[PDB]
Write a protein that binds this ligand. Structure first.
Ligand code: NAP
Ligand code: NAP
Lengths: 285, 281
């Protein structure tokens, strides 16, 4: 099959190389720290001695390092060896850095595809993998078959920063939800309730994750019907959360933050509308 | 069946009275603003004239208004009639306000039950109905059958404010999650991405065990990072820098950042994100 190069042998990089090898790709690997490829070489991987030698061994080069600052530090020595090849940046960073990488890649004659892995390494090489991809459509189709070895490719568009945008946007949701759960856990924990007793209920407050698409209809329509629950009614509930958190001894930074956003919308005349109307103030720094 | 009184005929109050009427309970209803009981009265409801007659008409009095100050203003005239009866307060408020109501009820000779409706009005009367209850166990056992008309009773304990604490905490999670989703929708929208195209992916990330898994790290006090708070914080930095460049407000993600920085300054950057609970506490 097509030869592929994985630059960076961390937890994810090692999984990526393994998935390429399992699909029959002659995989050339390289890492700054030696002693992490023993399992890959036993499966067929060729350990390269130089980044430039690794970049020159395959038509497709996948780089999976911590940030782009590292990606640019590793690949500058081989910046020209990227000649005529495609760089698949599966490093997670900002949309701006993905666009600067693309321009940097074009400067050195290389094609560029920006990717974002949305699963842990164990799920690479399996149908559970969700990898976003953005950049020139032709380049994706030309290498879609090779990238299938990693899992579920999902082309988003031509803008190199799209994949990163989806990435930071989905991590924005995940960590913000994370913080709310931990705050709720602490609040009930102030009265001795084990988190194991609150967790089955915290699963029910979300029931089917339908709200995602119900509110998306409002956002896309720009119409936030405040029928039933209004933003001002919801804001009253936040006040109860803040005063309960204060009374119970828990920090009230996060709930006050959500309260500030609600007030901003109410100050913009959305008091009557739904909570989804808070997006109107979220779009204004 | 047992007679029941419903004080407050807003969307929820009318749903509660209808659920009692369906279960065969003789239901007396009453509300400050007239003209909302026609459907209930056609199904058997008895519209009381005064709140003191309504309170006096039933052994079980269910009050469901906007807040605690409203219940205290609308029952203050009939505080004497409450003696010997049971006030089941389904009005959502703070745990402290729940403990105060129980005391006020006791001073007037009434048993008190604090409740928290976690479902919308349409779900009342249905198996999906989730209503938390707290207060003395005996009073709840005396009226479990009558309260079953409203749906899934979940008796939490004896503390009158316990049901309200579960209430605020689940709402803390719900609204915080809502805020994060809107911010993520705004972030993808800065590049024209329709919220309807993002919703399917937002679901895939949520794939529901993260609640129970962290509950054990929180119960054990052991936050093993392998993902560590230090790395997670660097991604939250990317969210802020990206949002600022994309023209999106950074207040909310920065609030999340301040929380991870607090736990890091406490010596948890090598623990899990779950360890944030320690600074929350
Ligand atoms: N759960 C996951 O693991 C997961 C899931 C989705 C996405 N990702 C993304 O995938 C990428 C890889 O993550 P990871 O799990 O492998 O851990 P990581 O610590 O983010 O990256 C480890 C890799 O980066 C290399 N590296 C970092 N800084 C370097 C530098 N200055 N010079 C040279 N190499 C450098 C490491 O080299 P050494 O090995 O020599 O130290 C190693 O190969 C990250 O961008 C991460 O956000 C990870
Ligand atoms: N319906 C829901 O979606 C839902 C779901 C779960 C929990 N809850 C909670 O359960 C309760 C039901 O709320 P709701 O949806 O019915 O609407 P609401 O606006 O929260 O409650 C309004 C009710 O309280 C009365 N009221 C409010 N302020 C009053 C005052 N100052 N003096 C006298 N009466 C006053 C209203 O009388 P008027 O009708 O005359 O204005 C009406 O009966 C609330 O505590 C809510 O937080 C509601």
């Amino acid at each position: 099959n097509t030869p592929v190069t994985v630059i960076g042998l961390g937890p994810m990089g090692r999984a990526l190389a393994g998935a390429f090898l399992a699909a029959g790709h002659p995989t050339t690997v390289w890492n700054r720290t030696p002693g992490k490829a023993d399992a890959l070489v036993a499966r067929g991987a060729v350990r390269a001695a130089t980044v430039a030698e690794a970049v020159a061994a395959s038509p497709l080069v996948v780089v999976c390092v911590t940030d782009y600052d590292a990606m640019r530090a590793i690949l500058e020595p081989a910046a020209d060896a990227l000649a005529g090849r495609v760089l698949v940046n599966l490093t997670s960073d900002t949309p701006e850095r993905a666009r600067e990488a693309a321009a940097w890649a074009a400067e050195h004659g290389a094609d560029y595809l920006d990717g974002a892995i949305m699963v842990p390494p164990p799920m690479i090489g399996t149908p559970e993998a969700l990898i976003f991809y953005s950049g020139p459509r032709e380049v994706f189709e030309a290498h879609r078959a090779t990238l299938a070895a990693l899992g579920g490719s999902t082309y988003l568009g031509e803008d190199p920063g799209l994949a990163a945008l989806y990435d930071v946007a989905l991590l924005d949701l995940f960590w913000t939800t994370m913080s709310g759960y931990l705050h709720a856990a602490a609040l009930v924990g102030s009265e001795g309730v084990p988190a194991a007793e609150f967790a089955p209920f915290a699963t029910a407050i979300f029931d089917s994750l339908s709200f995602l698409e119900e509110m998306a209809e409002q956002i896309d329509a720009g119409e936030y019907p405040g029928d039933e629950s209004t933003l001002a009614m919801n804001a009253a509930g936040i006040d109860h959360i803040i005063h309960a958190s204060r009374a119970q001894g828990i920090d009230t930074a996060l709930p006050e933050a959500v309260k500030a956003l609600a007030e901003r919308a109410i100050a913009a005349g959305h008091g009557e509308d739904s909570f989804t109307s808070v997006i109107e103030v979220l779009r204004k720094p």
